[PDB]
Amino acid sequence: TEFLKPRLVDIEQVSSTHAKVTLEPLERGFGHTLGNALRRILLSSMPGCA
């Protein structure tokens, strides 16, 4: 029961600081789980100096 471990296929660096990360395949309904959990953490909990 190791589920589906995906393969990062595309690292499209459009700029020096803007990227597209394409990651397939995931078990059905895990794209949203991972994408939203990340998006939330990145938006509202990453530390920095401002």
């Binding site: 959990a37 990340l38 953490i41 909990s45 990453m46």
Partner: peptide, 13 residues
């Protein structure tokens, strides 16, 4: 990913 992993590590066992 390292942040979420750490929170789940506390309760993965």
């Amino acid at each position: 990913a390292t942040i979420l992993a750490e929170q789940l590590e506390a309760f993965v066992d």
